[PDB]
Design a protein around this ligand. Structure first.
Ligand SMILES: [Cu+2]
Ligand SMILES: [Cu+2]
Length: 464
């Protein structure tokens, strides 16, 4: 389709090693209809902050909203002081600065709000940005690297809009149970955009930034995707796939071939997740149109990308159980509202504000559930046995290794560095290590990244 894919600005440090982000309301147009939206350095979404491993930057964050917000760097291994969870309040009109010393490998991470009880609304209203972490190793690989030509961020999100055009967000009994999801699919903000890519290798940095909707990327003509990276960065070698399931807040980088003059789309396939299979997501849905052009691209697909550390021996490692639950009365009413609204289509494949839980407790921001060890591998066992909802479980402060994802060894493209693991009626195990500290006043969060679950209790705080 006609409008070109918007390309987030690649924001680097200035002469004082500073970067400025302004958080503001603005306006966007979706299918001819204007809507109030929120953005970083803009009306909608945000820039791609570019960082170099081992080099420090100060970020000056200005809240130009009229409500409180927080700024979290999802995927970044930083102290709890700069991590920007629910306790990282930036008052409206106020300025807060954080020093980040990046000490992890090349990876596409991202940033987004983490306001207590309202994170779902603030992301839905428009707030997300990328983080391009670079190191010495990755630049040696000669991957596609022309930002916005053959190296393009692709941030995919759904939205629901009112008859008047305004984003129609609500945290109610239905969305607390099944999540906020919509009928309009957005790609860097645009409805079904087009991208001119040169012949050879196209590098796509995929981010699922939907609140609650899982995706599954493929191509319309079924040309393969070569996955080169996960949440925490480079896989050891490429993993070649026909389709790519992505959970809320997960990133993958893929190279895809642009070989003839023939256009093709990037698409998302229907998922079996409650609520998410209603038309138009009952069939393959286009994400963006790739349009070959002949201009110069020398990007490469290496045989060998990186070498990752080995999984540690499990013996002696501390084990932490995290039992995710939902009040069954939220479950019921939730699925009933869903049934009322949409009907049988919804199934293709009491304060509800504290109804979602971990270890029998809705998130309390004052009482960290535990102190985790520093610089020592632990094994966390996260169970969703007891309900049928999807829970992409996420841990701040870390890139971990999945030992077991929902009852099975992880797929090859998911066995490298991840910050999210799937939990859905089964149990997952991960090998977590924290290299930085987080006091109780600025605790790390562990939580479901189905944002409406997070906002109604499915989060805990922990210290290091
Ligand atoms: Cu995070
Ligand atoms: Cu959940």
């Amino acid at each position: 389709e006609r409008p070109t894919l918007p390309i987030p600005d690649l924001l680097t440090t200035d002469a004082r090693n500073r970067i400025q982000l302004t958080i503001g309301a603005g306006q966007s147009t979706f299918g001819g209809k204007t809507a109030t939206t929120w953005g970083y350095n803009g009306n909608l979404l945000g820039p791609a902050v570019k960082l170099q491993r081992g080099k420090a930057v100060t970020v000056d964050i200005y809240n130009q909203l009229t409500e409180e917000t927080t700024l979290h760097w999802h995927g970044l291994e930083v102290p709890g002081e700069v991590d920007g969870g629910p306790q990282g309040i930036i008052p409206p009109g106020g300025k807060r600065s954080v020093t980040l010393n990046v000490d992890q490998p090349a990876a596409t991470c991202w940033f987004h709000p983490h306001q207590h009880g309202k994170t779902g609304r603030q992301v839905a209203m428009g707030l997300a940005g990328l983080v391009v972490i670079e190191d010495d190793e990755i630049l040696k690989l000669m991957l596609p690297k022309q930002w916005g030509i053959d190296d393009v961020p692709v941030i995919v999100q759904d939205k629901k809009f009112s008859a008047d055009g305004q984003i129609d967000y609500q945290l109610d009994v239905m969305t607390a149970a099944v999540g906020w999801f919509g009928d309009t699919l957005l790609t860097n903000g645009a409805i079904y955009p087009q991208h001119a890519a040169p012949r050879g290798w196209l590098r796509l940095r995929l981010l699922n930034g939907c609140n609650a909707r899982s995706l599954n990327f493929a191509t319309s003509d079924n040309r393969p995707l070569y996955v080169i990276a996960s949440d925490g960065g480079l896989l050891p070698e490429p993993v070649k796939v026909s389709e790519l399931p992505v959970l809320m807040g997960e990133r993958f980088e893929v190279l895809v071939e642009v070989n003839d003059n023939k256009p093709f789309d990037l698409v998302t396939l229907p998922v079996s997740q409650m609520g998410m299979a209603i038309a138009p997501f009952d069939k393959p849905h286009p994400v963006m149109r790739i349009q070959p052009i002949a201009i110069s691209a020398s990007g490469a697909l290496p045989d060998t990308l990186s070498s990752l550390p080995a999984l540690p021996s499990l013996e002696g490692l501390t084990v932490r159980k995290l039992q995710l639950s939902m009040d069954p009365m939220l479950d019921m009413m939730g699925m009933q509202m869903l049934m009322e609204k949409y009907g049988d289509q919804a199934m293709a494949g009491f304060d509800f504000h504290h109804a979602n839980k971990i270890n029998g407790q809705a998130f309390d921001m004052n009482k960290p559930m535990f102190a985790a060890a520093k610089g020592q591998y632990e094994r966390w066992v996260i169970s969703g046995v007891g309900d049928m909802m999807l829970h992409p479980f996420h841990i701040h402060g870390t890139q971990f290794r999945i030992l077991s994802e929902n009852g099975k060894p992880p797929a090859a493209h998911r066995a490298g560095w991840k910050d999210t693991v799937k939990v859905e009626g089964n149990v997952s195990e991960v090998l977590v290590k924290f290299n930085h500290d987080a006091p109780k006043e600025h605790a790390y969060m562990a939580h479901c990244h189905l944002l409406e679950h997070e906002d109604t209790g499915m989060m805990l705080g922990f210290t290091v």
